[PDB]
Design a binder for this molecule. Structure first.
Ligand SMILES: CO[C@H]1/C=C/O[C@@]2(C)Oc3c(C)c(O)c4c(O)c(c(/C=N/N5CCN(C)CC5)c(O)c4c3C2=O)NC(=O)/C(C)=C\C=C\[C@H](C)[C@H](O)[C@@H](C)[C@@H](O)[C@@H](C)[C@H](OC(C)=O)[C@@H]1C
Lengths: 1332, 51
């Protein structure tokens, strides 16, 4: 706070105005929080293993009154720790130990138990564990599980207008999507007949489900329709009239009652007439006997005398039917209230299409729909229908499903049953009809309130759930016949069934993938990623604001199907996406933060991230740009309920790292944030000269760096480890302590890059908690450096920059700055063949002494021996007996007297063209085969190296503890010179006067002895892990893994890009002599083609250049005053000037800093350049940039004169020169490049195939055939698809001619077509080749 | 078949799974034959397996 210790080393000058109210949270939050909820002890149904347990439990047998319940669970210590788990290849996992209680109820109970055996913690499976950095290790490889985005469980009402039937009229459909179980779909049709289908199955008339719920027709009309009361009073047909019923209808007869005619015939009833009837309270009017000719009778009507049905429910009455029910004494007749506009007569017409009658009928017709063709049964239909939506087992909405369900139905309860109830189905139908009636609207799938976010924690729970159901069937099956006290909860519950559910997910699943680690940003941008069809879902939605990044998505087959998480976004309590906001009460902007979900934010009026307020925080302008409901417009001063937290929150970590983003077109911006993840780390971690201010946060939040656990002073600094002596205020009373950081050294990444940590602090320096102790790869002094900035000139240079091509000075490759270190893992397997076992022995037929030189006696290359293409890394030989040679080979051996060995050479040799240094060797051996010499040496080395490390722990630790005892002993009994004389081991005897200090000595004693023994146990375990024979695959006797470190610099063909989306491929590496130089004589590193700038609209790349130039100026200047050794005063003065820069920025600054030791160190770090921070949308402006160029001594234009290093003459016009940050992506040319002359061939069809990593030939496609067909080239095409590939004969007959000097082809027939003939002929088809 | 049976009990009985030589002592024969027998006993993989 108010500046840390590594901040005193270097400070980034920050332009930008808007003060940051909230600072970027942990970027890895989602991944860690989710998994943290899965595995945890939660005393309730909140999501977790506890919840997944409580669902399926207790498990009772079949009627046998034998029940198995669940007590509690625990996670055993991991078999291997994270580092060890990677080397061996097993998964990083913990044993799951769960206590089970087996109760058996006495047969023919009152419920009571004969005996109950409590089986102590039965083990089921080992579940993977998440690393402190949020990754998983499946088989020896760090893998990330991407969060998924799917449709939230609940009810959803859609349209399907347009395309259907092309008559318009739209449609309205509802869909009930449970978290688990079958789908329930309701839909209309062009006839306004409501239909239902379970899942995607056959369409069925909607009402058929209501009957299966035991609802007769009378109650269906009574549910969905209102009642028009008809009275026969005195004689001939009176009627009850609700005065509102006359809206939207024209009088069909004289509407008169109470001796006064309210409406005549042919006069439509408007608001005036309705008012008269409403205000005059006209209950009963006289109607004609013919009006009921269309009215559908509500309930059943029978003849009281004859006991016969006069008319069934849902029947249209007629003038003749009225007669037959009138003489029977019926006063009242209920009919449907039907209006083709307001309340539609839909259900009525749905019943007339219903083939069923009663519940059993519907159940028969329903059971035969799902499982057709088989005879229906009553018990079968009942069981099925109750098991679909009414069974707690086969159906659940869980909490989110029930909540949105109730929420979308306008209910009160936010939580409820996890199955469907008859009330639920009826309500859903009601809502669908209401939308068709015009009151209410349909949802849209793209809204982020209907899009729910899962993540590792939620997904693993489902798989573990699946494991428990497939084990459930087994437990019941055994408890069926079980003998009383013999079996216990072990013989039943297996391991393999449950473990394989979880194992099949993390091992192979589309959501579990290799972490993309070539780059810290790549990691952190992978760990935040989403996954979800036509263009609607791919497109950006208004609800994406602050939740999903609009501009970071892949460009390709799936666009907008990935996105990435926004900066400040958080998973909602229920699992939606919520974003930070500021509550604006009255006219003040309050700094209380409020998280609003997608549906929550909708109604509020939210201000803009960019707005002007001041003092008390009253809006300066009388109206400010805001967005309210799905749209944005100008809003009045005091209306706004909330305001945006920060200017960044719209974008993502990727996009937030692009300086001057506001100035770049979104296409190039996308590509930029897409390409920035590919930047391979460099040899010298540099720093961005132009920046944002996220780079610090990205570096730290990602685990690539090493952060201080507790603050203090550095006791010891080595390139290996770092030991910090903790401050006492931060230190716990017992054990005293020091924090020991073991740094990661050079090692292979997933992408074969180098990940190596370097100490950024110096001996005996104050460090505060949360300070960077050591940089990782591609991080500099706590910031994130994905590349190296360099001097760049925009101008066409003799076409060598032609398209995007980049022309780079030799100075760059000489400085070795863009050099890159690759670590490749090569393997050698000694397998077992029926002919015999393969030997790793160093005796290889037909190799000279120079070849076997680099190998030790055992046959393995020495560690550290530099190798090139073709050198033998591991000698290996496999038995092949009875070679069966030929006459002339036999004479050859006879003349030269060589004994042809019974063993063939399989030895592992360095791939063609790659050259590096051997940094490591591992030897895995089958358990029971004798470890060879070298393998034993390695084991001995690992043993000794292990002992040194552990001893180092104990040595520094013990001193750290005894150094505290020295201090506590001096309080109350101080003897200074006396105490350090006697042996340190004898200190533990001295007590103290009554005080807590006597108890403090006690505390330090206990923990001391603990360490003594903890060290012991740790050493033993390590030793066993070394000596234990590693488990290998079937058939493999031993494996040798060699680790080569190749150092590649840069060469034509490599891909290079800036943060602004400008790609490039280095064309020529030009001498420093030919480089354009300025009057001062300093050449320029890179010459970019300006023509790429206007077409692709990215203007930031120019700004980034300009400000960069300015930045280097402030650097260069300091480099002069430091080389002048002026004094602290002059330096201090000039720096202060820089950090203010003319007005109104948020930076603040010094004279609190110590004027000597702290200031001089800062200037030394600035002399390379002055780091500047351009916030994403708050970033600097031209004027600010031009003023910094004034302080720079450099022109405002940003252009200068340059001279061609060849002719030495000037260049017409000034050219823009500056400093642009540039990344080296890993496409590097010596990977992509392949060439093949004659390689191996596929067996099934003879075709070129790389088996040696000598790549198969290029694929010649159909389109290329057309290309040859358009040219007149017949012979090139024949040779292309016959002799060069598919002709097993023609190829050899050709090769022999090529060396003989005869260019011809004796083509023959491609073997592919020759196979098609037999394949056709394998059928009953006789296919012959005719004539001649 | 005899091996599967032992591997079943021994799966949870041992808490991990019997070592390749564990069922070997349980079984009558020379006990190194586990490797040989286990290999030829495996069913061939469909050459049409999508990868
Ligand atoms: C198990 O997952 C696999 C396939 C699932 O199948 C399948 C059908 O379901 C997918 C899911 C669920 C994805 O989320 C996905 C994806 O997110 C993505 C690409 C596109 N990949 N590219 C391919 C290479 N190319 C030169 C560039 C574009 C994909 O094809 C897929 C993909 C599938 O196709 N892209 C990105 O996210 C962006 C823009 C950057 C990616 C980061 C790096 C590159 C990857 O993480 C690398 C390190 C590995 O992780 C992958 C290799 C995974 O493979 C393994 C075994 O790990 C792969 C996703």
């Amino acid at each position: 706070m108010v500046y840390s210790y590594t901040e005193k080393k270097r400070i980034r000058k920050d332009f930008g105005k808007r003060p940051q109210v909230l600072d970027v949270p942990y970027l890895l939050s989602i991944q860690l929080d989710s998994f943290q909820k899965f595995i945890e002890q939660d005393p309730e149904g909140q999501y977790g293993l506890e919840a997944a347990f409580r669902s399926v439990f207790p498990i009772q047998s079949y009627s046998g009154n034998s029940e198995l319940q669940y007590v509690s669970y625990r996670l055993g210590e991991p078999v291997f720790d994270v580092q060890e788990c990677q080397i061996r290849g097993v998964t990083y996992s913990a044993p799951l130990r769960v206590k089970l209680r087996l109760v058996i109820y006495e047969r023919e109970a009152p419920e009571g138990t004969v005996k109950d055996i409590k089986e102590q913690e039965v083990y089921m499976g080992e579940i993977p564990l998440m690393t402190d950095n949020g990754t998983f290790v499946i088989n020896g490889t760090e893998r990330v599980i991407v969060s998924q985005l799917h449709r939230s469980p609940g009810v959803f009402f859609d349209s399907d207008k347009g395309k259907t039937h092309s008559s318009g009229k739209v449609l309205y459909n509802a869909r009930i999507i449970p978290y688990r179980g079958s789908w329930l779909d309701f839909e209309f049709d062009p006839k306004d007949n409501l239909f239902v289908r379970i899942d995607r199955r056959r369409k069925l008339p909607a009402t058929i489900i209501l009957r299966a719920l035991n609802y007769t027709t009378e109650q269906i009309l009574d549910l969905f329709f209102e009642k028009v009361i008809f009275e026969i009073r005195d004689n001939k047909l009176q009627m009850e009239l609700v005065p509102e019923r006359l809206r939207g209808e024209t009088a069909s007869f004289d509407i008169e009652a109470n001796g006064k005619v309210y409406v005549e015939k042919g006069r439509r009833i408007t608001a005036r007439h309705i008012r008269q009837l409403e205000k005059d309270d006209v209950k009963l009017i006289e109607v004609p006997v013919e009006y009921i000719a269309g009215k559908v009778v509500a309930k059943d009507y029978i003849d009281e005398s004859t006991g016969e049905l006069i008319c069934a429910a849902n029947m249209e009455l007629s003038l003749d039917l009225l007669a037959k029910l009138s003489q029977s004494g019926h006063k009242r007749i209920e009919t449907l209230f039907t209006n083709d506009l307001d309340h539609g007569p839909y259900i009525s017409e749905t019943l007339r299409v219903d083939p069923t009658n009663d519940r059993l009928s519907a159940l028969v017709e329903i059971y035969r729909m799902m499982r057709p063709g088989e005879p229906p049964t009553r018990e079968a239909a009942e069981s099925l229908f109750e098991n679909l939506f009414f069974s707690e087992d086969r159906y659940d909405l869980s909490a989110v499903g029930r909540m949105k369900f109730n929420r979308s139905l306008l209910r009160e309860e936010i939580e409820g049953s996890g199955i469907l109830s008859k009330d639920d189905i009826i309500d859903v139908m009601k809502k669908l009809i209401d939308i068709r009636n015009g009151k209410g609207e349909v949802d849209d799938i793209d809204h982020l309130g209907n899009r729910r976010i899962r993540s590792v924690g939620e997904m693993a729970e489902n798989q573990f759930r699946v494991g428990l159901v497939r084990v459930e069937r087994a437990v019941k099956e055994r408890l069926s016949l079980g003998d009383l006290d013999t079996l216990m909860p072990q013989d039943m519950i297996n391991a393999k069934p449950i473990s394989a559910a979880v194992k099949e997910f993390f091992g192979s699943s589309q959501l579990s993938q290799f972490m993309d680690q070539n780059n810290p940003l790549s990691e952190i941008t992978h760990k935040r990623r989403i996954l979800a069809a036509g263009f609607e879902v791919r497109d950006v939605h208004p609800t994406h604001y602050g939740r999903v990044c609009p501009i970071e998505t892949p460009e390709g087959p799936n666009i907008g199907l990935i996105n990435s998480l926004s900066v400040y976004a958080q998973t909602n309590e229920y699992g939606f996406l919520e974003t930070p906001y500021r509550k604006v009460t009255d006219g003040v902007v309050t700094d209380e933060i409020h998280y609003l979900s997608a549906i929550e934010e909708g109604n509020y009026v939210i201000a803009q991230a960019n707005s002007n307020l001041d003092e008390e925080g009253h809006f300066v302008e009388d109206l400010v740009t805001c967005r309210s409901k799905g749209e944005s417009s100008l809003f009045s001063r005091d209306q706004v309920d909330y305001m945006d937290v920060s200017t960044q929150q719209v974008v993502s970590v990727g996009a937030s790292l692009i300086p001057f983003l506001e100035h770049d077109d979104a296409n190039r911006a996308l590509m930029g944030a897409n390409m920035q993840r590919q930047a391979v780390p460099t040899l010298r971690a540099d720093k961005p000269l132009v920046g944002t201010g996220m780079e610090r946060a990205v570096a730290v939040d990602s685990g690539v760096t090493a952060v201080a656990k507790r603050g203090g002073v550095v006791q010891y600094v080595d390139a290996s480890r770092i030991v910090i002596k903790v401050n006492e205020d931060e230190m716990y009373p017992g054990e005293a302590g020091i924090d020991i950081y073991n740094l990661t050294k050079y090692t292979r990444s997933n992408q074969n890059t180098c990940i190596n940590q370097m100490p950024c602090v110096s001996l005996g320096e104050p460090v505060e908690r949360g300070d960077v102790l050591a940089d990782g790869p591609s991080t500099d002094l706590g910031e994130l450096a994905l590349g190296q900035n360099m001097r760049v000139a925009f101008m066409p240079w003799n076409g060598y920059n032609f398209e995007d091509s980049i022309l780079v000075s030799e100075r760059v490759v000489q400085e070795d700055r863009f050099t890159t270190i690759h670590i490749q893992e090569l393997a050698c397997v000694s397998r077992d063949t029926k002919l015999g076992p393969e030997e790793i022995t160093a005796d290889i037929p037909n190799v000279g002494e120079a070849a076997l030189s680099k190998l030790d006696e055992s046959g393995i290359v020495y560690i550290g021996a530099e190798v090139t293409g073709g050198d033998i890394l591991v000698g290996k030989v496999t038995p092949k007996g009875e070679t069966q040679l030929t006459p002339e080979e036999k004479l050859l051996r006879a003349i030269f007297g060589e004994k042809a060995s019974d063993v063939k050479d399989s030895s592992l040799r360095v791939p063609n063209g790659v050259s590096g240094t051997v940094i490591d060797v591992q030897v895995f051996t089958r358990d029971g085969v004798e470890k060879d010499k070298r393998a034993l040496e390695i084991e001995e080395m690992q043993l000794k190296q292990a002992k040194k490390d552990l001893s180092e722990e104990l040595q520094i630790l013990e001193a750290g503890l005894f150094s505290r005892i020295r201090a506590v002993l001096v309080a109350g009994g101080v003897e200074a010179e006396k105490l350090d004389k006697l042996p340190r081991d004898r200190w533990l005897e001295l007590g103290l006067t009554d005080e807590e200090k006597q108890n403090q000595l006690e505390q330090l004693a206990e923990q001391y002895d603990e360490l003594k023994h903890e060290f012991e146990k740790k050493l033993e375990a390590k030793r066993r892990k070394i000596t234990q024979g590693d488990d290998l695959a079937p058939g493999v006797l031993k494996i040798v893994k060699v680790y080569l470190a190749v150092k590649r610099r840069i060469q034509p063909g490599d891909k290079m890009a800036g943060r602004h989306g400008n790609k490039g491929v280095i064309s020529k590496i030009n001498p420093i002599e030919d480089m354009p130089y300025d009057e001062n004589g300093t050449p320029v590193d890179i010459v970019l083609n300006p023509l790429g700038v206007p077409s692709r609209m990215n203007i930031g790349q120019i700004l980034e250049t300009h400000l960069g130039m300015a930045a280097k100026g402030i650097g260069d200047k300091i480099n002069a005053m430091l080389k002048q050794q002026q004094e602290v005063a002059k330096l201090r003065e000039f720096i202060q000037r820089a950090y203010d820069l003319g007005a109104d920025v948020r930076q603040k600054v010094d004279l609190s800093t110590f004027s000597d030791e702290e200031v001089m160190r800062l200037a030394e770090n600035l002399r390379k350049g002055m780091p500047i921070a351009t916030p994403v949308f708050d970033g600097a402006k031209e004027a600010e940039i031009k003023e910094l160029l004034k302080l720079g001594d450099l022109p405002t234009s940003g252009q200068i004169r340059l001279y061609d290093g060849r002719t030495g003459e000037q260049f017409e016009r000034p050219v823009t020169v500056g400093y642009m940050y540039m990344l080296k992506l890993n496409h590097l040319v010596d990977d992509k490049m392949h060439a093949r002359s004659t390689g191996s061939y596929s067996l099934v069809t003879q075709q070129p195939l790389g088996g040696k990593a000598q790549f198969g030939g290029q694929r010649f496609g159909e389109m290329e055939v057309w290309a040859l067909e358009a040219y007149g080239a017949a012979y090139t095409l024949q040779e292309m698809l016959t002799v060069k590939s598919d002709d097993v004969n023609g190829r050899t007959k050709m090769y022999k001619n090529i060396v003989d000097g005869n260019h011809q082809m004796e083509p023959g027939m491609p073997e592919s077509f020759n196979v098609l003939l037999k394949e056709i002929r394998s059928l009953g088809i006789n296919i012959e080749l005719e004539d001649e | 078949n005899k091996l599967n049976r032992i591997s079943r009990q021994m799966l949870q009985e041992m808490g991990r799974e019997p070592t390749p030589e564990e069922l070997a002592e349980r079984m009558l024969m020379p006990e190194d034959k586990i490797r040989k027998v286990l290999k030829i006993a495996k069913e061939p993989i469909s050459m049409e397996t999508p990868i």
